[PDB]
Amino acid sequence: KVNVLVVGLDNSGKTTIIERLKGFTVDEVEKGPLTFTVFDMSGAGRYRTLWEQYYREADAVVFVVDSADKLRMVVARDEMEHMLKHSNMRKVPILYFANKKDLPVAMPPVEIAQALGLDDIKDRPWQIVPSNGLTGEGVDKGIDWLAERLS
């Protein structure tokens, strides 16, 4: 099994995106040897310890961000940092979906990289792909980037 975590704050669009492909709550989506484990990083410390249990077997991460929500980008950055620093998270590829690129206030990848501090990630591959979860624009491109980097 190839395990891909699909994460981000609530309202980022992750359920909408993964639908295209096929207390604390998780959803599982199978696509052959790929298994997507999909969950929200909402609630801060309330459930964080639960979801960190999925890190050990993670082969890649899809981090979904609402491109148009600055406030939650603050919390998203924090949760991302917890993930990166966790001893069970291996140095596996991270695909960032800059989702809701259709919205007027959508931040472009350069702004998102700055907001999240992605340029400081130098120990594993990562890429930001703007996406529209409603039309599917960008989604296949992002998944293909990730799939070619599995090991």
Ligand SMILES: Nc1nc2c(ncn2[C@@H]2O[C@H](COP(=O)(O)OP(=O)(O)O)[C@@H](O)[C@H]2O)c(=O)[nH]1
């Ligand atoms: N405008 C716009 N809305 C989106 C996009 N992707 C998802 N949404 C909407 O954002 C809301 C939250 O989506 P959801 O998949 O439930 O996010 P989740 O909590 O991370 O799974 C839903 O109402 C979606 O219809 C997008 O690319 N553009």
